[PDB]
Design a protein around this ligand. Structure first.
Ligand SMILES: [Zn+2]
Ligand SMILES: [Zn+2]
Length: 82
């Protein structure tokens, strides 16, 4: 369309807010993951949404998400297994 409308008032704030929801993060609640911060609660599996503790999870390369060590997929390639 074609119209002359430009003049909104909004803001975001510092880059210290969870990614899942987008709320304020604490110093003992924020999860430094690849630069991005997440809530201890939000941060969970993508198949079982289970609290992914710092040491019991992995971020699959393929897609690029975070899954548990029980659901985490693995690149598919010729098995050529005997
Ligand atoms: Zn969150
Ligand atoms: Zn899982």
């Amino acid at each position: 369309g074609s119209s002359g409308s430009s003049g909104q008032h909004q803001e975001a704030g510092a880059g210290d807010l969870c990614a899942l929801c987008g709320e304020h993060l604490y110093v003992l609640e924020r999860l430094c993951v690849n630069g991005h911060f997440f809530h201890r609660s939000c941060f969970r599996c993508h198949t079982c949404e289970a609290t992914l503790w710092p040491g019991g999870y992995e971020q699959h390369p393929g897609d690029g998400h975070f899954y548990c060590l029980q659901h985490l997929p693995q690149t598919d390639s010729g098995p050529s297994s005997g």
